[PDB]
Enzyme design. Structure first.
Site, PDB file in Angstrom:
ATOM      1  N   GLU A 154     -55.576  34.212 -47.009  1.00 62.11           N
ATOM      2  CA  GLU A 154     -56.882  34.480 -46.443  1.00 62.11           C
ATOM      3  C   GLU A 154     -57.448  35.753 -47.058  1.00 62.11           C
ATOM      4  O   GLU A 154     -56.725  36.494 -47.736  1.00 62.11           O
ATOM      5  CB  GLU A 154     -56.778  34.656 -44.921  1.00 62.11           C
ATOM      6  CG  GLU A 154     -55.950  33.603 -44.171  1.00 62.11           C
ATOM      7  CD  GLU A 154     -55.876  33.863 -42.665  1.00 62.11           C
ATOM      8  OE1 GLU A 154     -55.796  35.039 -42.247  1.00 62.11           O
ATOM      9  OE2 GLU A 154     -55.918  32.885 -41.892  1.00 62.11           O
TER      10      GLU A 154
HETATM   11  N1  LIG Z   1     -49.963  33.744 -45.230  1.00 60.88           N
HETATM   12  C1  LIG Z   1     -50.480  35.074 -44.916  1.00 60.88           C
HETATM   13  C2  LIG Z   1     -50.363  35.996 -46.162  1.00 60.88           C
HETATM   14  C3  LIG Z   1     -49.030  36.026 -46.851  1.00 60.88           C
HETATM   15  C4  LIG Z   1     -48.574  35.338 -47.925  1.00 60.88           C
HETATM   16  N2  LIG Z   1     -47.369  35.890 -48.284  1.00 60.88           N
HETATM   17  C5  LIG Z   1     -47.083  36.879 -47.456  1.00 60.88           C
HETATM   18  N3  LIG Z   1     -48.065  36.976 -46.579  1.00 60.88           N
HETATM   19  C6  LIG Z   1     -51.978  34.935 -44.750  1.00 60.88           C
HETATM   20  O1  LIG Z   1     -52.610  34.378 -45.646  1.00 60.88           O
HETATM   21  O2  LIG Z   1     -52.686  35.725 -43.871  1.00 60.88           O
HETATM   22  C7  LIG Z   1     -52.370  35.727 -42.450  1.00 60.88           C
END
Ligand SMILES: *N[C@@H](Cc1c[nH]c[nH+]1)C(=O)OC
Ligand SMILES: *N[C@@H](Cc1c[nH]c[nH+]1)C(=O)OC
Ligand SMILES: *N[C@@H](Cc1c[nH]c[nH+]1)C(=O)OC
Ligand SMILES: *N[C@@H](Cc1c[nH]c[nH+]1)C(=O)OC
Ligand SMILES: *N[C@@H](Cc1c[nH]c[nH+]1)C(=O)OC
Ligand SMILES: *N[C@@H](Cc1c[nH]c[nH+]1)C(=O)OC
Lengths: 81, 229, 229, 81, 81, 229, 229, 81, 81, 229, 81, 229
Positions: B116
């Site tokens: 995101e």
């Molecule tokens: N999935 C999480 C971000 C993420 C990817 N790798 C470690 N953290 C996201 O996109 O935001 C909540």
């Protein structure tokens, strides 16, 4: 599906049921059935007339945003990342 | 972020909206493994969730009042003052948020991943704003690939969407991107039963979003692009 | 945030402190539906929790060491330097936090809602400070109404309290507002039993805070306003 | 109460019991009995003598605040909003 | 150990088992067996070439850090404090 | 943060690495109760976790793809521009994170406690940097004692480690300190069984890290200081 | 007995042997409601159970050693002395047992019913013996109808079989009729899983006995009438 | 099948699973999964050389009968009627 | 009642619930809720026209008796003494 | 059988029929401890069960079709031939069964006890028959006392009833005495819920049989002695 | 013991616990913990003065026998064979 | 029956009485497989159970009042009239019961087996009676072997005991043989806990009957042959 069949052999299942009537429930909440989760994509934005109280301005904007479109109303939102 | 072995996505894995098997890639990104990763506008998936939960007015299978929904989320808040040329630091004319979901080729090793982003906009030219976003995808697609690389993960598709808004003078804007993780209620599943847990999912796996609405007696709210985020 | 269908509030729904049925509204706010929403100082409810958990000295039914208590919370931290006229940006002489609980008229549709706030204080005049707070309620009561409006929720009461502190020169202050979500232990419930889950709650629903302390052999720590936050 | 009676028909219950002796437990923690939760209102504040280490200054102030009045001592605090 | 023996009398147990094959699981996740938890210490750091997109720059640095050394790969990380 | 009654620590309580019963205190801190609190470099415990989870290459008992691991954590991110003398505000040449685990003398009243920290570094002199850290312990040991005082907790040991990195010009650095809370899988426990829950732990309580690796057929990755954080 | 709402029958409801949809009624009995109740020789169902459990030699999915299998059963034991003309009272040359299963038309009100019988035989003429049995059906069919009448139950089919044996001079015979009530093991269900309880049954509901043996790699022991009871 | 669908609404289910490997289990035995039962038809007979001990003569005949054909070997047989 | 209160301290409870709609269930049957039982007194008798088949004559008389008065219809009756 | 700590009796402990607090002892028996044990005709309790389960015609909360109800029971079967003076051995003109329930003074040590009996009648004089029974109580009361003595059990009341029938010439009679052990369904409990297990019992503990029928909308079938056993 | 270790791999466990205080419980009774059973050997005999009521004579003799030596007092005895 | 995979025997597998590792075979029986099967007097095991349950006077861990204990059992009842030379058919001067437990060599395939018997005695010469029994073993040992043969089961030991009684003139005797199947209570297990299920058994597996009594504070009732059955 053909997929679950491979997970079930690893000890994983993706059943996620809510014992409630009509309402969806948060993963991990007690009383849910199954050890999986269903997820979705919600992006939205909301505005509020600037008072002096920043926090409150944000709380409300956030509130109006949750309420917009895909309704996730009176929810206690936890955060994962 | 992630959505791995223990998950499915509304509109995609379950309640699939045909828009998926009719969408065309906006472009591709080279994954470390050397294969391409097509990118699509996540519009279908976004609309899908709307059908399921409902809206403040036409409420449906939304979360229980006061429940605890864990969400992979992020947001942003900024101020747009009353005309005021001195636009302090974290101020702007609009605000935006973006979200991306990348499915792994092999869900049994690699988890599907969420990425995101959000930010503030500087020119009152909304029309312009869109151009920025239209480019942002490329930006995200890059980070995405990097992460993939970081864990030796390989995706097949990747869908990304956004949400924006122009604040009126003196209005604070809050842009949010959020992936919720829920369990489904019984009555939202046609011919299901509290005693047939695994079967209940299979039903959802099979029912396309269209069918679902019909079998449930729900009018399509996503209609023909009826929704703007 | 919220506290809906799955919840009760210490001091109010359970272990009710008579202070509730003896308190008078500080003022009212017009809800979207056209009815008034009386506002009370949340002092009773605050003191109540204190009786239950206990204090560092007179410890009672506090959370297990190392437990994971989810809390709807927020806070604030600021620096008060050594006299220093140059008081940088996020610095001040004191810090404060506020919390509000609004119960819905119909808990079966609408969840009861929490609204918290916090901030830094600028004048060393504590006496003044209070006036600010004494006004802040009106500020919160407004946002509250707006949220209500946002979800078509309707409340009947609404209780709000605060906590503040003047930092000594060179002292960092941390003001916190926090709503914890727990489960109650057996021994804190008179005549309860691990085998009578639903009955155990009914007991709490009925026992007034006073009675509880007596039946438990606990001296009232809230005594007569003995507690300042 | 007369209320639960309406919830129980929706599939909701508000029983929240802690299998521990004397101690309260966090909602969602395993081993708890019932699918509900009890909540309360705690507002407090604490101070610490300014060192250079901001984080630590905050950690401690926070700690002294948790410990003040309504004791929520050695707790791993999750955040919802 | 001699310790658990004192806890079991208070209603506390520290069994924490994951029904999955080979993988560890988050405390509170459903399907886990036991009402305890095992914890560890991971400190690491990672870097990414500065683009304009701050968030993304952080997301990736964070990702490269999680992946470094003690691997906590594709994890949804909740935060407690 | 904490790790109390419901917990054990990899490398210490379970899968103990002998490094513990061979380590010497870097110094001591006076606890409120008047006793000393020896401080050790948490290197053993850090290496230990590495052996268990494995690495991106030599993967072992890492968390399930897409699982939700709750972590007591904190982090920090800073920018090191392209040489540029004007180094804005939150910029630097390197970034660091620190973590501390303090075990209570009596785990039945007091929970063991985590204390983390992180920050940005200002001089490209890495060699220097270490000196800072080498001092930071004393800084933490102090706060630790304060907290203990705050809850009348008393510890016996306390282990602290760090992680740092110099960003290349134009590279953003992210330093993280994180304590994960998991459950262990069956196959990672020698002679265990899904039907012998409590016994399975006893096995881990007894097996030293060395033995474990052997009994599992795992080569020691921590080897002889092979790991730098 | 009975086998109602909570049950299914091996060979019939699950693992169905085609012999059913190829068998012809031996005769009919007038049920109180005025409809006929065809009667079939229960040979198919009997053979079916044999395929599943296996035999002492070719063992398959038999009950766990020392398990507690509840059975709707009855039996009979008699003595055949050494020629001896004085054949006391409860003595004979052979012994027999019989069993009948009647399925209700509407399993949601009426439970399907078992009716067993057994007895001693008096003439060493085995050939004769059979004639007796061949008539006994009519006898049972009558009681069956009476019971139906007793509870206003209505069946559609009804299958009956027997077992007999001639004791050698000085040999005690034991004839048993027995309906066991079990739960099925995982490995006996193709593509099943401990995590898909309801689905596992559906598989059995669908797999015909033939298919099952093939998909399992089991040779048909019932073969072509290879079994005599 | 279409049937279960009507029972599940009455609160009845016919799932009957044995957690054991290869072996079938008695209805009501603990650890079984599901609230139903599968039943079958076994009729057989066996003989033993008449000693004086009637009971024993019967025990054995019975044993030889259980073991004959459809094998229900070393089973503790309860009786319902 | 005041009694259960003494039992609950011994580990005994007398809750006996049937998950079925309208129907009562046998103690020990799976899916029942609670670890107790409710019992009653039924005495009755029935007759059938003597055929040669004794067993069957009894089966039916028994059936007509179960069906008489307090109805315990199509029940698999276990025996305790 | 017995009915101890884990039990309650329909009509007595739950769904109590006033007939109890209006009945008078037929006589008393001296218990080992030296106190008397009043004996009552169990008519009330018998009628009570009838109200709950219903009859073949007016069915109510009877056992699920095909369920397994464990019963403390016994019975008797005899033949009454066609006039025939030669009345073989186990033959007669009628058959009877009896049942007794004795409640312990202290249910926390002693279990309440059942004592059943049955037999064949020899004189076609039904009128006579009753006299026999009217005496049998004394016979049972004796054994009862003996058992009590055997385990040092002490009862306060004891209720006994019977059932008989005259077989027509050529009719086989079957007299049964039976105590069933069940669990109660939800809908049979007014204002109950699957989520309030312990409360559901309390409701039954309080509701008198009369009230129950009314609150349920059931006409009393026991009416005024409308039932003969 | 070394044995259970082989059973646990077949899905069998022999844990048999009674949630009651001091009292033993029957295998299959609800609320028991574990899927196994413990068994023993009791042989005894008792007598009663012959009245006319055979059944009752037996009931009592049986009662006096259960009560003799290894006490299995007020027990509802099921029968398996 | 049997006692297989899911079981253990008091006095043998758990709470072992040394009498076992000090007893000598009364004789041997040739098993089908060609090996011998030593036979011992089951006195130890019998006494053991007595220690655990307690007696009517010195009560211990007996079954809950009104519990349902399933038992592999059998019995016998006979009449000894008032001198009367005409001793009808099923009458005698005494009555007896016997029980045997045979453990399989490999408990993972074969279940251990129980073999019971009972009967009436004809000569008032008690002294004689014993001789009969002393022979009966050989009788049982034979059937045992036959059953073994029937299922290809192979045992290593086999213990058998009896119980008898001479009825006074006019006294009915009841001889019973019974194997109960229970679950053990917490307090009967030293240092056990409701939370350590599997560990609790291991404790019993290890504690010898002697130790148990001591650790429990129980006087040995079996003492030195203090018990006659
Ligand atoms: N999935 C999480 C971000 C993420 C990817 N790798 C470690 N953290 C996201 O996109 O935001 C909540
Ligand atoms: N209840 C939350 C704020 C809230 C209300 N609506 C959305 N979010 C709270 O007050 O802070 C934790
Ligand atoms: N354990 C937490 C900090 C803490 C200590 N007391 C309150 N909070 C940690 O070190 O950071 C996640
Ligand atoms: N189903 C039982 C007999 C039966 C029918 N009605 C009452 N009892 C059976 O056939 O024998 C076990
Ligand atoms: N309760 C049983 C008889 C009984 C009493 N003591 C041992 N057995 C009953 O009356 O018959 C089923
Ligand atoms: N174990 C039973 C008898 C048995 C052995 N094989 C089949 N049946 C016992 O000895 O009597 C209860």
């Amino acid at each position: 599906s053909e997929l679950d069949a491979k997970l079930n052999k690893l000890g994983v299942d993706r059943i996620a049921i809510s014992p409630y009537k009509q309402w969806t429930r948060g993963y991990m909440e007690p009383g849910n059935i199954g050890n999986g989760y269903v997820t979705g994509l919600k992006v939205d934005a909301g505005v509020r007339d600037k008072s002096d109280n920043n926090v409150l301005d944000g709380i409300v904007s956030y509130d109006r945003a949750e309420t917009k479109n895909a309704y996730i109303g009176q929810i206690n939102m936890t955060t994962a990342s | 972020x992630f959505t791995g072995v223990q998950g499915r996505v509304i509109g995609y894995d379950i309640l699939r909206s045909p828009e998926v098997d009719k969408a065309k890639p906006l472009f591709t990104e080279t994954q470390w493994d050397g294969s391409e990763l097509p990118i699509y506008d996540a519009k279908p998936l976004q609309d899908a969730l709307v059908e399921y939960f409902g809206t403040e007015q036409d409420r449906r299978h939304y979360p229980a009042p006061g429940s605890f929904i864990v969400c992979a989320n992020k947001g942003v808040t900024a101020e747009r003052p009353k005309n005021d040329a001195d636009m302090k630091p974290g101020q702007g004319y609009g605000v935006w948020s973006a979200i991306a979901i990348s499915f792994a080729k092999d869900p049994t090793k690699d988890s599907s991943m969420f990425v995101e982003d959000a930010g503030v906009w500087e020119t009152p030219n909304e029309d312009e704003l869109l151009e920025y976003l239209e480019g942002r995808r490329k930006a995200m697609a890059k980070s995405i690939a990097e992460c993939g690389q970081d864990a030796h993960a390989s995706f097949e598709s990747s869908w990304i969407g956004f949400a924006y808004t122009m604040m009126e003078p003196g209005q604070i804007g809050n842009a949010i991107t959020v992936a919720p993780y829920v369990s489904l209620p019984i009555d939202s599943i046609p011919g299901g039963s509290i005693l047939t847990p695994d079967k209940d999912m299979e039903i959802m796996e099979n029912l396309t979003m269209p069918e679902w609405l019909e079998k449930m007696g729900y009018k399509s709210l996503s209609a023909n692009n009826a929704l703007k985020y």
